[PDB]
Every structure is written in structure tokens, then in C-alpha cells.
Amino acid sequence: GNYKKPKLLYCSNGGHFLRILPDGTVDGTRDRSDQHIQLQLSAESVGEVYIKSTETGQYLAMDTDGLLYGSQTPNEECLFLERLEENHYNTYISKKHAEKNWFVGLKKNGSCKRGPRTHYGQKAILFLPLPVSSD
Amino acid sequence: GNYKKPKLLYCSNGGHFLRILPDGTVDGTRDRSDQHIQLQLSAESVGEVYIKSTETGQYLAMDTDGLLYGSQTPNEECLFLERLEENHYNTYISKKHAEKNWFVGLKKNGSCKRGPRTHYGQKAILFLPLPVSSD
Amino acid sequence: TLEPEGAPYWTNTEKMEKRLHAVPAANTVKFRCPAGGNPMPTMRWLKNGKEFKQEHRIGGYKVRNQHWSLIMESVVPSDKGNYTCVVENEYGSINHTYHLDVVERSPHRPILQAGLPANASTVVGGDVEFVCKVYSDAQPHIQWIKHVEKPYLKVLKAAGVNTTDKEIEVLYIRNVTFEDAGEYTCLAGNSIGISFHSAWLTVLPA
Amino acid sequence: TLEPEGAPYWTNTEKMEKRLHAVPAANTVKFRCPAGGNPMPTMRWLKNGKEFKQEHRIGGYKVRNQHWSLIMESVVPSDKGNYTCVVENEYGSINHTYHLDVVERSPHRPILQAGLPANASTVVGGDVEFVCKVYSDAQPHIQWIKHVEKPYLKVLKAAGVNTTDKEIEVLYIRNVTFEDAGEYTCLAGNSIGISFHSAWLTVLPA
């Protein structure tokens, strides 16, 4: 899956696509036709990406309590370290709170994981880039 | 595992090493220290190998009833087609009876599989090259 | 104690709502259809709506009609598709279909399309273009540089938060000057490594 | 009905004699230690004799102390080692250790060592050597060829059923003649593809 086009972020945990809802909250849905799961990633520098929702223009961000929200402007809380583990899953670590290892994660219920509650031994932080349609 | 040195052929099925016993019979053992499991492979042409036991000089062979035996000379029944499935397991098809798909295989009990009774949908035909010791 | 006869039913719906199973190649996959019913329902698997035999894939598969599951290890692209569990007894037949998505990843430095950017020639005062096309799994950061003033490199254009693909793909040099002659490079870096391709600009007089 | 109290014991030894688990990378692994006993024995896992926590590997692992098993998916080289299940109740502790072997495969055409064979020079009448070192997972077939009489290639030496590694690795040319000048090539082919490296022999007079 070349980087260019918008893509889906599929969480290994419950099989949910990362979703940024119109009211600014972040969760996960199994519905592949949902219009809030199409994400365009971009980068200002090697290994650090911005994750933006094509539908509503909001960027993914992580606040100081480890909470995921959709932001209207790309600020320092919108910068995620993208790691490709040869395990072939991607992980997204908040750049602002990299020291504490705060991971983008989705629980089995489709609700967001908070920074503090994540760590490397979980399926909640493992994502797989998927094309918008058929694959 | 570069090709050069002698190696172990570990069957996925029960976790047995392919063994050529001194009396000419072929089976499988879980004992990694057994002296009849060290095999040197060689080739006369691309993709076709001879499998020989370093301990007793016998070559692996498959008779017309699909029976595995150790042969004293490398004849046409000693030639196996070596396939690497990206699935990362190797399979060994008798060259003499390639038309019928007769596979080298080991049952879960460590006894040999007969050509006729093998097919692609089995773990009995899946082998993994392993070094003689520590790995 | 003993309960009544009837057509089959799902006993656990929580381990079955995950319909899409997307895994990298070589991983094992397990689909569940935990059923109940009396008489004891029979379970059957179809692959893209067809009878799914053991010899249909290398290594076969393990069916545990004790666990009401189908397990396929070492998943490969030829396994992609829909898997339907048909569970039945004398009074009915229920069913569910999972979708198997096998992903292939390429952990590599960015691959620049062969021959791009291409060298260019122009009379002073004309216009030129340089093209760069990149292939990358990890999100790459692409930019256009010039090997200059002889200290080395000058950044002509760079990808940012919201720059379009179109914008960074082509480097336009308008009104070419002799100073503009020289080496143009498309630089692409990802978390695995960096790649670059160079093009020379020949400026002529007239 | 109810049975007596005692220290734990293995209820199924048949799914446990496979001690060495050797799998390619990215495959899932499941170790069983099906236990029995009363009181209900507790199960615990050690990795190379140490407490094995969830955060000790990426993606963690699933323990089913219902199934008396340990499942690790997406196996990678850092998981290699011994896994011990310690099962116990108030009257005793039993245990078993599995060995996890994670194999990495390279489905590639043969890789010839950089720079070999090397060019050589000699006065007519002297001796020379050509070396070829090959790396290959699939069993390769190696041979030495000469680009001649100008029809193309002449086979100087070839690997067979029982030729030693030493024999095909070095090509010796004794008493060099002017005819012996020319291109020497080590050719290596496997079921994935073929690779070759050339060396020129310079013959001089004197």
C-alpha cells in the first residue's frame, strides 16, 4: 500500500478502523463504509507523520492526559512517531509524550485507549494500513 | 541457513527430524542428538537435490509403491524436487513420480508417509531446514 | 439439565462480531461460529461460497467442531476471501461469513521510479521540469534539492503537513538562467532509510 | 463424580511430546501443558527461566488457563528460547519446558560473495586460481564456465552428487597458455534464480 492515497487504520484488537468523528472525538468502527475513517497521512520529517481525516479536515491529536481528540490545526499534539515493526504492524507513538510511550490504541469495544493505559504488550496498539476499498 | 553444511529436516507435523536408519528404513525422531538425522544435500541441476545421510552414506529414495528407503547409490529414485514455498517451508517431491505428486512426508507418529497417501493439504510434507546444533 | 430440540443458534456473539480479519502474511487465522442446538448441529465451511477441502491450500487447515472454529496458519494471498460457516441440524441451518484480508508489507527505503528525475536541456530563458515518483510503505518525507555554490545543498521545495502529491512530484524551473544549470535531486526518506535520484540541467545560450 | 485431592498431573501427554517448536517468523505458536488435579492447579509461564510478562514482547500473548496453553502470534527472533509451564496447587508443582525456534528464510537467487572471482594475471606457463563463494537457502547448483571460441560457453568444472565444497569453490588453471586467457564465470542457480560473476584472465609473455 503505497503511501499516497488516503487509507484505513485497522486495529488488530477488535478489527476496528480508527475514526475521527465530526464532534472531535476518536473511536473505532467496524463499518468500512463510514466516511470518518478515511485518513490521509503526511510528513514534515522522516518517521513522524500527521494523520488527517479527509472527511472533516481534523488531525489526530493526543492531549496531556493521553486522550485522543480530533484537532482543527496541526500542532505539536498532532505529531505521531510512525514505527513499522517487521511483525508487519504499525504503531503510533505521540511525539509530545514519547518519553512515556503513549500509544494510539483501540480497545476491543471500539473505544479509544488512553496513553497511560497502553504499553508494548498489547494488541490495542497494532494497526494495519488498508486501502479504502476492495484491497 | 546457507546450503553448505549438513542439516536437519524438521517436519512440521509432529516436530520430527527425517532419519535414515542403518538398516535402510526411513522414519522420524525427536532426538536432536541422533546421529542418523544429519543430512547433506547436493544438486546436479537447478531445483533437484540428492539428500544424503552423513552417518551411513545412504541416499533417500522413494520406491514405486511410494515407499521411502535409504539407498546405497544415487539412482533415479534418489532425486527429489526441492520447492521453497514462501510459506517458508520446503517440500520434497519424488522426481521419478512427480506426475502423481508423491511427497516426502512424516506422520505425527514419526513413521513415514507413503507417496500415494500424501497431498498438498497436509502438514506431513512441510519441512524446515535446521542446523545440526544451537541454531 | 437437558434442554429442548430446535434449530441451531449462536451461543457466543461476542467472539464473532469481528467480521473482517486482516492480518499480515504468514500469520495464523481463526474464525469462530460457536453454536448450540439439539440435536447437536453439524458445522461446515465454504471458501468464497464453495466447498473448502484440505488440499485447497498448502498445509491444509484445522477444524475443531468442538470449538466451532476454522484455523488456517501461514496465511498467504491465495487465501484472501469470504469464509462461511454453515451450522445445522434437522430443524434448521444458520450461518456467518468472515472476510479474510491478507496484507503484504514492504519494510524498505523509498523506491524512486527508474529514470526520474530525467536530465533536461534548455536555452537560457526557457522552462524545464523535473519529475519524481516515489513508492513507500512507511510515510515518506520528500524534497527537492540542488547541489550548489562551489557548501553543498539547497532546498528548492519540500513536502509538509498539507502539500499535495501533485506539488512535490514535479519541480518546475521557470526562466532558466545559467545559475540554474547543475544537479537536481529528489530526496525521499522514511523510517527505514533514504533514497535519491539526480538529474543534470544543461543550460545553453541563444 | 468428584475425585480426590492431590498434586497436579498431566492429563494429556500426546499433545505435549513435541518439545521443539520450530516455525518460520511471523507464525503463531501454541504450547500446551494440559493439567489436572484438585484443588484446581494454577498455571504459570517462564521465558528462559524468568517471569514472562505481557510487555516482554510486542503484541503480548494469550494465556488460556482453561486450555492450559500459551499462545504467541507473529513470532520473531527475540522470542527464541525455552518456555516453561509451572502448574501447581497446594500439594505439588509439576512442569514442562518447550523450546522455541524461530526460523528466518531467504527465498532468493544465489548471492555470490562480492568481488569473487577476481581477475588474475600471469606469465605464460604460470598457474592461477579463481574463487567463488555462494550463499543460498535453496540448494544451488554451481559450475565454472569459460566464454570461448570467437559459440559461447565451455564448462570447466561442475558440482555433482558428491563433489566437495572445496572442489567447486576454487578453479585452478595450471600451466597457463594464451588460449586460457579470457573470461571465467562462476554460475550458480537455485529454484529461485541464477547469479554469475566474471573474472578476466590476463596472459602475458616471458
Per-residue burial over D20-56, b = 16 or more CB atoms within 10 Å of its CB, e = otherwise: ebbbbbbbbbbbbbbbebeeebebbbbbeeeebeeee
Q: Do C25 and D25 touch (CB under 8 A)?
A: no
Q: Which domains does chain B carry?
A: 1-135 (2.80.10.50)
Tell me, yes or no, if the two domains C1-104 and C105-206 fold the same way.
yes
Per-residue burial over C61-95, b = 16 or more CB atoms within 10 Å of its CB, e = otherwise: bebebeebbbebbbbbeebebebbbbbbbeeeebe
Distance CA D104, CA A101 (A): 29
Handedness of CA A15, A18, A21, A23 (dihedral sign): positive
CA dihedral angle for residue B93, residue B98, residue B100, residue B105, rounded to 10 degrees: -10
Is C105-206 a CATH 1.20.58.220 domain? no
Cell numbers found for residue A130: 488498508
- Judged by DSSP in three states, B29 sits in strand
Distance CA D37, CA D87 (A): 10
Rounded to a whole number of angstroms, the distance from the CA of A22 to the nearest CA of chain C is 20
Place of cell 466447498: C51
Q: Sort out which chain B residues have CB atoms less than 8 A from C53's CB and list them.
A: 121
DSSP state of B32: T
Residue C187: closest CA among C105, C106, C109 = C109
Cell numbers found for residue C187: 530526496
**Contact partners, residue D1, CB within 8 Å, separation at least 6:** none
Distance CA C104, CA D167 (A): 41
- CA–CA distances in Å: residue A127 to residues A11, A67, C27, C132, D206: 4, 18, 15, 29, 71
For this entry, resolution in Å reads 2.4
Distance CA A129, CA B38 (A): 44
Experimental method reported for this structure:
X-ray
Question: To 5 degrees, how large is the angle CA D141–CA B89–CA C67?
Answer: 170
The strand ranges marked E within chain C are: 6-10, 20-24, 29-32, 35-38, 42-47, 50-51, 62-64, 69-72, 81-89, 92-103, 111-112, 120-123, 128-131, 134-135, 141-147, 153-158, 170-173, 182-189, 194-204
Q: Do D141 and B82 touch (CB under 8 A)?
A: no
DSSP state of C54: G
Q: Sort out which chain D residues have CB atoms less than 8 A from C25's CB and list them.
A: 26
D/A Cβ contact: 3+ pairs below 8 Å: yes
D71 to chain C: closest CA residue: C28
Residue A108: closest CA among C16, B110, B112, C115 = C16
Enter the CATH code of domain C1-104.
2.60.40.10
Nearest to C162 among A1, A42, A87 (CB): A42
Give percent helix, percent strand, percent coil of chain B, each to the nearest 5: 5, 40, 50
Question: Within 13 Å of residue B121, how many CA atoms lie on the same side as its CB?
Answer: 10
Q: Sort out which chain C residues have CB atoms less than 8 A from D103's CB and list them.
A: none
- CA–CA distances in Å: residue B50 to residues B65, B70, D28, D136, D163: 20, 12, 32, 16, 12
Place of cell 504450547: D31
Task: Tell me: is residue A13 an annotated ligand-binding position.
Answer: yes
Q: Give the CA radius of gyration of chain B.
A: 13
Residues of D at the B interface, defined by Cβ within 8 angstroms: 17-25, 80, 101, 103, 105, 107, 134-141, 159-163, 165, 189-192, 194
Give me the residues paired with residue A130 across strands.
A8
Question: To 5 degrees, how large is the angle CA B33–CA B34–CA B36?
Answer: 140
Domain boundaries, chain C: 1-104, 105-206
DSSP state of D160: -
Asked if the bond preceding D117 is cis, omega within 30° of 0, the reply is yes
- Decide the pairing of beta strands C170-173 and D6-10: unpaired
Nearest to B88 among D18, D105, D192 (CB): D105
Distance CA C173, CA D70 (A): 61
